[PDB]
Design a protein around this nucleic acid. Structure first.
Lengths: 56, 111, 50, 102, 123, 186
RNA sequence: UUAAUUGGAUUCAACGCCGGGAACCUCACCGGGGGCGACGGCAGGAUGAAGGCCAGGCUGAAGGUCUUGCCGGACGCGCCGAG
């Protein structure tokens, strides 16, 4: 007859499982969502671009 | 009367809305917040056995059903994530959770 | 590409109707006649024998 | 005239009164009566991350901090003056927001 | 339809060059049917006022009642030696062993000289 | 949202184009990107060594550059410019890349410190360093340090006041990670 | 112990540590249902689809699968280099 259809239909709309980062493609790190959409590993290198300062 | 709700037959006519009051927060919650189309096909399976066109036995992997009267007197094969476990539905199981009725492991004290 | 399907009947000199024609697609598309139920391959419908 | 509140938020220490006493220059093309720059608080954003990916044992986590420092200037002047200020706002460095009331 | 087994008339070449350009002008007019099965309907029901048929149409699932059908229906059929010559000149771009033009409102000139040449000499 | 958070939502877009440009302009040689952002339109002046692969053959790269920025950028009017790099040695991002070319060849660690440590200093610099992490073409991990002038100093001051480049130089045996730190005069 | 209890870490330098989000998701792990292989090459092309589909019979859902009758227009499975 014919080959089946299948499509992506997982409820990713809530939780950590909804999130993603544009800069490493994953969200397995501890993500930050307020402000920027990036993780903690993209804020070790990113942070002084955005005027975040190392000093205390 | 007797059992969970009132007489089984009488309950069917009442079905919708009225059942809610008798049971907990959970059963009210499932019915009020809709379902998914995979569940809705199962609703049709149960319906054909309890009346009308020829039966379909109810296969389900879902344990998210809350027992309705139309499920009584029938054998439901629920996948617990290993295998299918048949369950005969009673009037005492109305309003009570599907997942309770089938064990999902062999659960014994550890020792 | 192909292989292998025909289900169109061949008449000589005259015209025949194999099946019913969809009224939602005009003529061109022929309904499968099971008994009382109409299928349509063009888009996919559930249809009943009007 | 029309009252404008120019609210000027800046990430740099020395770009904040240098564009709040020299935005008086940009502004003035017609007569203006201008209020000297009034300091509003530093609103402080912290974001703390682990620098450790593994986390194990003892560890030291980086607490970052960005301080955005606010000046509010009032000016009473024509449409043209306000325009000078919203016509250019450089690379940012300096965020310029404008509130318009009569 | 046709076969290279079946010759009934000889198609002049002068007619043949302009009957592979006839299909193309008349495809954007109305309905176009293509492929051998599609061409069968177009004669079955009698929609088409010209079928064009390459000789290579096989097997005789298609041929049983269909070579007289076009003559009775009063439409000419004209031969292309190959389906890769009716497949690269007709609009269609992957070999077509038969195509049928419904509405020669734009190939009217060409398609009437066929019905007095391959339907005069022998239908 | 806030006006505190308007330095976290323009600054990120600048990060995104720095990472994508450096990679796709190794055909020309990359060095920097001076991005000047105005509400009118984002005007990016690409510094590259070769002008003829960053304009393309007929605006082949130019069409790629128009279409790229718009996905990333909230500014839907990008303009493009190419300026030339006019001192490759002044900048740390054309000496990371120059050292990477020499390593990828098999030109050893000291035999390429002729032209990335005896030429950079002739140009002017308060200090320069090259660091080369890897295995040093071995089978176990080792690093080597070459140092000239002031560029590490007590405190954050005079070591976070630098010009900084990192390149990847690919081996068929591994990766070698290429750091060149120029601190210009000042 | 369980169908599986996903993996790492495992003296300091592992154990509220990656997990500062652990019902499906997350998720790697497990169980059952279906299924894709690019770009060239290879026989195939209109001898009609790779796609579609009533109705019951079956699937956790999908003419997916079967009996059964039927369309719209036209290139890709299978593999072999190699992604």
């Amino acid at each position: 007859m014919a080959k089946a259809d299948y499509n992506k239909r997982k409820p990713r709309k809530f939780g950590k499982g909804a999130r993603r980062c544009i800069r490493c493609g994953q969200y397995g790190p501890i993500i930050r969502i307020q402000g920027l959409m990036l993780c903690r590993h993209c804020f070790r290198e990113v942070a002084p671009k955005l005027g975040f300062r190392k000093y205390e | 009367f007797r059992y969970r709700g009132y007489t089984l037959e009488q309950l069917m006519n009442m079905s919708l809305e009225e059942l809610a009051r008798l049971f907990p927060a959970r059963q009210r919650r499932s019915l009020k917040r809709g379902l998914t189309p995979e569940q809705k096909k199962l609703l049709r399976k149960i319906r054909l056995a309890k009346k009308g066109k020829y039966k379909k036995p109810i296969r389900t992997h879902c344990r998210d059903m809350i027992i309705l009267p139309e499920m009584v007197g029938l054998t439901i094969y629920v996948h617990n994530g290993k295998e299918f476990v048949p369950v005969e539905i009673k009037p005492e199981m109305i309003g009570h959770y599907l997942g309770e009725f089938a064990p999902t492991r062999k659960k014994v004290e550890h020792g | 590409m192909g292989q292998k399907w025909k289900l169109y009947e061949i008449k000589d000199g005259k015209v025949i109707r194999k099946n019913k024609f969809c009224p939602r697609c005009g003529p061109g598309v022929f309904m499968a006649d099971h008994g009382d139920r109409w299928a349509c391959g063009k888009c996919g419908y559930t249809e009943w024998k009007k | 005239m029309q009252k404008a509140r120019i609210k000027i938020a800046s990430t740099n220490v020395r770009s904040l009164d240098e564009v709040a006493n020299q935005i008086k220059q940009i502004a003035e093309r017609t007569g203006v009566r201008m209020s000297g720059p009034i300091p509003l608080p530093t609103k402080r954003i912290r974001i703390t991350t682990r620098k450790s990916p593994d986390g194990e044992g003892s560890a030291t986590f980086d607490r970052w901090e960005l301080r955005v420092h606010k000046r509010l200037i009032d000016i009473e002047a024509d449409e043209r003056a306000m325009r000078q200020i919203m016509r250019i706002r450089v690379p940012e460095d300096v965020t310029i927001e404008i509130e318009l009331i009569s | 339809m046709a076969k290279p087994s079946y010759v009934k008339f000889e198609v002049p070449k002068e007619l043949a060059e302009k009957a592979l350009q006839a299909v193309e002008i008349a495809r954007d007019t109305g309905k176009i049917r293509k492929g051998t099965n599609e061409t069968t309907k177009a004669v079955e029901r009698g929609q088409a006022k010209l079928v064009i048929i390459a000789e290579d149409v096989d097997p005789e699932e298609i041929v049983a009642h269909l070579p007289p059908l076009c003559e009775e229906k009063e439409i000419p059929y004209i031969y292309v030696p190959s389906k890769k010559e009716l497949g690269a000149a007709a609009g269609i771009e992957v070999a077509a062993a038969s195509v049928a033009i419904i509405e020669p409102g734009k190939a009217r000139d060409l398609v009437e000289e066929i019905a007095m040449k391959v339907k005069e000499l022998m239908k | 949202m806030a006006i505190e958070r308007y330095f976290i939502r323009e600054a990120v877009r600048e990060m995104l184009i720095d990472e994508f440009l450096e990679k796709e302009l190794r055909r020309a040689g990359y060095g920097g990107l001076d991005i000047k952002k105005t509400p009118l339109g984002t005007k990016v002046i690409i510094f590259a060594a070769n002008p003829g692969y960053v304009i393309g053959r007929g605006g082949r790269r130019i069409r790629e550059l128009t279409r790229i920025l718009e996905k990333q950028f909230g500014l839907e009017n990008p303009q493009i410019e190419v300026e030339e790099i006019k001192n490759p040695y002044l900048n740390a991002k054309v000496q990371a890349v120059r050292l990477a070319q020499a390593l990828e060849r098999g030109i050893h660690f000291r035999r390429a410190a002729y032209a990335a440590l005896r030429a950079i200093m002739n140009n002017g610099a308060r200090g320069v360093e090259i660091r080369l992490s890897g295995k040093l073409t071995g089978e176990r991990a080792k690093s080597i340090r070459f140092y000239q002038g002031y560029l590490a100093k007590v405190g954050n001051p005079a070591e976070t006041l630098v010009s900084k480049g990192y390149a990847q130089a690919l081996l068929k045996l591994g990766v070698i990670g290429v750091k060149v730190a120029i601190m210009p005069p000042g």
